[PDB]
C-alpha cells in the first residue's frame, strides 16, 4: 500500500551548534553580598534536576579543540572580569617617582622587597603628603634614561594604568555550572576512556554541567576534576611539537603553598575617600614564600604519566626538563592563592625520567618527605590579553596557606633530534583556555531538532 509523509513533533534529534549558555552556581553563594563572589550576582541558582540520565543506545562524536564552549567560557570569564573590576579604584597616583631604599640585610634566597616612599594626593585633592609602602621587586622598574638608581616606577604606566581589586570581592574558584538554554541540551560522555576526539559510544544527558572550577593556573591544574579509572592524555595532534598536551590524573597530587612572611595591610588614602592598600612592615622574620609536593607521590604520578606517554610513544623512554624560559608569567607556574598570586619556579619538579619500568617507591622511607618550590610573588598582574591586561592584587595580612590538589599537567614536547630514545617534554601551557578545556572534556551542546517527517500508511481524512 502507498506511503504518505507523516510529521512528528517532540522528536529526539540533534545538531551540534553554537548557543549562549547560562551560568549557574550552588545555592550557598547567594546569602552573601553583591559580587562576593561573582557567582552570587552574575549567575542563576542551580537545580540538581534533571538526573544524569543515560542514553544507552546512542553513539555521538565529541570534541574539545574545535569545541566552541571553552572559547565561550573564556569570553564569559573575561567579560565578567572587566565588569567586576569596573567599580573599583582606578589608581594612577601611584606612578609618581618612587624613591626606594637599599638595605644592609644580606640578599639571597629570602625574597627581599623594596621599601618605596612616594608622594600621594591626600583627601585634600590639591594637597599632598609623603607616604611609604613596600612593593615586591617584580612590581617595580628603574625609572628612565634620566638615570638614578634610587628612583623607581611601578611596572605599569609603560602600559594602560591598573586597578586594585576591591577587598569586598574574593577570588575563590567557586564552582560554576554551565547550563544549555531551553530548547538545547548538553550531552555528557559516560565512557572514561575518551581520548579527546572521536565517538563516545555511551553518553548521558544533563541540563547543567559539573561545578566547573574557574581556576587560574598556568603549568599545573589546581583543584580540578579527576578521571574515573585511569590517567588520561589529551591533545589535538600529538604529531605537532607546538600543540599543548593535557594530562589528566586518576588520583590527585597534593600541593601546599604559603607565605611565611607576615605582612600587615597598610591603608593609604588616594584622593576622594578611596583607599589604596599596600604591604606595610614585615612583622616577623623574613622568610621564603614557597610550595611543597610529596616527593614520592609526585614521582609515582610522573612515572604513571610516563606509562601513558609510552602508549603514544612506545619505543622511547620519557625525559622531563626545565620550563621554556623567557617571560616570567609564561615560564613560571603562576596561580592564585588566597588573594595573593604566586609565581613558582617549577624546574625542581620536572627533572626526573621514566626508565620504561616502574621504579618502586614501596616501602616508603618517609611519605612526608617533600620537594620544595621557591616562589616569587607579584601584586601587579598582567593576567590576559584584552581584559584591560592589568590587576593590582592587594596584600592580605597573614601567613597564608592554600593547601590544594593537583589533578592535571600541561606539558609540551621539545624539538626532536636524532629520533632519540629519550625525547623530552616541558611544561609550557600558558593559555587559560586549556585549564577549562581540561575540565569541560565530557560535554557538548546539542540543538534539538524536534520537527521530523517520516512515512507511514495514513493520509489526512477528507
Amino acid at each position: 500500500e502507498n506511503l504518505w509523509v507523516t510529521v512528528y513533533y517532540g522528536v529526539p534529534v540533534w545538531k551540534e551548534a553554537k548557543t549562549t549558555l547560562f551560568c549557574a552556581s550552588d545555592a550557598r553563594a547567594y546569602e552573601k553580598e553583591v559580587h562576593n563572589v561573582w557567582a552570587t550576582h552574575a549567575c542563576v541558582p542551580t537545580d540538581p534536576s534533571p538526573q544524569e540520565l543515560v542514553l544507552g543506545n546512542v553513539t555521538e562524536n565529541f570534541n574539545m579543540w574545535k569545541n566552541d564552549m571553552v572559547d565561550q567560557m573564556h569570553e564569559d570569564i573575561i567579560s565578567l572580569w572587566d565588569q567586576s573590576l569596573k567599580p573599583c579604584v582606578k589608581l594612577t597616583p601611584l606612578c609618581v617617582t618612587l624613591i626606594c631604599s637599599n638595605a644592609t640585610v644580606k640578599n639571597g634566597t629570602v625574597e627581599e622587597m623594596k621599601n618605596c616612599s612616594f608622594n600621594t594626593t591626600t583627601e585634600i585633592r590639591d594637597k599632598e603628603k609623603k607616604e611609604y609602602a613596600l612593593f615586591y621587586k617584580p612590581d617595580i622598574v628603574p625609572l628612565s634614561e634620566t638615570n638614578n638608581t634610587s628612583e623607581y616606577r611601578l611596572i605599569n604606566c609603560n602600559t594602560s594604568a591598573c586597578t586594585q581589586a576591591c577587598p569586598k570581592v574574593t577570588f575563590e574558584p567557586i564552582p560554576i555550572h554551565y547550563c544549555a538554554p531551553a530548547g538545547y541540551a548538553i550531552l555528557k560522555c559516560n565512557d572514561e576512556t575518551f581520548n579527546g576526539t572521536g565517538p563516545c559510544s555511551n553518553v548521558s544527558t544533563v541540563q547543567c554541567t559539573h561545578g566547573i572550577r574557574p581556576v587560574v593556573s598556568t603549568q599545573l591544574l589546581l583543584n580540578g576534576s579527576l578521571a574515573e579509572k585511569e590517567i588520561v592524555i589529551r591533545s589535538e595532534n600529538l604529531t605537532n611539537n607546538a600543540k599543548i598536551i593535557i594530562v589528566h590524573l586518576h588520583t590527585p597530587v597534593e600541593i601546599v603553598c604559603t607565605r611565611p612572611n607576615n605582612n600587615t595591610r597598610k591603608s593609604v588614602r588616594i584622593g576622594p575617600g578611596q583607599t589604596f592598600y599596600a604591604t606595610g612592615d614585615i612583622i616577623g622574620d623574613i622568610k621564603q614564600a614557597h610550595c611543597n609536593i610529596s616527593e614520592e607521590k609526585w614521582n609515582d604520578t610522573l612515572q604513571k604519566v610516563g606509562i601513558e606517554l609510552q602508549k603514544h610513544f612506545p619505543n622511547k623512554t620519557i625525559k622531563y626538563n626545565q620550563s621554556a624560559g623567557g617571560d616570567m608569567e609564561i615560564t613560571t607556574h603562576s596561580f592564585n592563592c588566597g588573594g595573593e598570586f604566586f609565581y613558582c619556579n617549577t624546574s625542581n619538579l620536572f627533572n626526573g625520567t621514566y626508565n620504561g619500568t616502574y621504579i618502586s617507591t614501596n616501602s616508603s622511607a618517609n611519605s612526608t618527605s617533600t620537594i620544595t618550590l621557591q616562589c616569587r610573588i607579584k601584586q601587579i598582574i598582567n593576567m590576559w590579553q584584552g581584559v584591560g591586561r592589568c590587576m593590582y592584587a592587594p596584600p592580605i595580612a597573614g601567613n597564608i596557606t592554600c593547601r590544594s590538589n593537583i589533578t592535571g599537567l600541561l606539558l609540551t614536547r621539545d624539538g626532536g633530534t636524532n629520533s632519540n630514545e629519550t625525547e623530552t617534554f616541558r611544561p609550557a601551557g600558558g593559555d587559560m583556555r586549556d585549564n577549562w578545556r581540561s575540565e569541560l572534556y565530557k560535554y557538548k551542546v546539542v540543538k534539538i531538532e524536534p520537527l521530523g517527517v517520516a512515512p507511514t500508511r495514513c493520509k489526512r481524512r477528507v
Binding site: N2, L3, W4, V5, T6, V7, Y8, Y9, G10, V11, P12, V13, W14, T19, T20, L21, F22, C23, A42, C43, V44, P50, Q51, L53, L55, G56, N57, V58, T59, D76, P181, A182, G183, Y184, A185, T205, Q207, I448, E449, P450, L451, G452, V453, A454, P455, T456, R457, C458, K459, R460, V462
Partner: protein, 132 residues
C-alpha cells in the same frame, strides 16, 4: 511497555532507541522546550532564542495542518526517492537520530508541499461547508 504513564525520560531518553518506541513519549521532547530565568543581557538573549525557535517550530507545524498538533498524517505522497527504504525497516529496526541523516537532504521541499496542500484543503473545506 513504552506506555509508561508516569513518563520520566527527561529531555531525550527516547534517542537512539527504535522509532517504534520513540513514536510514543514525544511529549517529553516537546514539553521541555521552555525554561530558565534571569541573568542580564546574555541570558536574556538566550531566553528569547528559545521562545522564538519554539514559535518557529509551531509555525511549521501549524501551516501544515496538524490536528492534535504533535502527530498528524498528510495527503502529500511519499515520493519514494526520499528514502527508498522499507516501512518496517524504518520504524522497527532504525532510530530517529539516524533518520535525521536520511531525510535532512530533502526537508525544505516537503516543508512547502505540506504548506500548499494544507492551504488547498482549507479552501476546499470552506467551499464544501458553503455547499452543505
Amino acid at each position: 511497555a513504552v506506555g509508561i504513564g508516569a513518563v520520566f525520560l527527561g529531555f531525550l531518553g527516547a534517542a537512539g532507541s527504535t522509532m517504534g518506541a520513540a513514536s510514543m513519549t514525544l511529549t517529553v521532547q516537546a514539553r521541555n522546550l521552555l525554561s530558565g530565568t534571569v541573568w542580564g543581557i546574555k541570558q536574556l538573549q538566550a531566553r528569547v532564542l528559545a521562545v522564538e525557535r519554539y514559535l518557529r517550530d509551531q509555525q511549521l507545524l501549524g501551516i501544515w495542518g496538524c490536528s492534535g498538533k504533535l502527530i498528524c498524517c498528510t495527503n502529500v505522497p511519499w515520493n519514494s526517492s526520499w528514502s527508498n527504504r522499507n516501512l518496517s525497516e524504518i520504524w522497527d529496526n532504525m532510530t530517529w537520530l539516524q533518520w535525521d541523516k536520511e531525510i535532512s537532504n530533502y526537508t525544505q521541499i516537503i516543508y512547502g508541499l505540506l504548506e500548499e496542500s494544507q492551504n488547498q484543503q482549507e479552501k476546499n473545506e470552506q467551499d464544501l461547508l458553503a455547499l452543505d
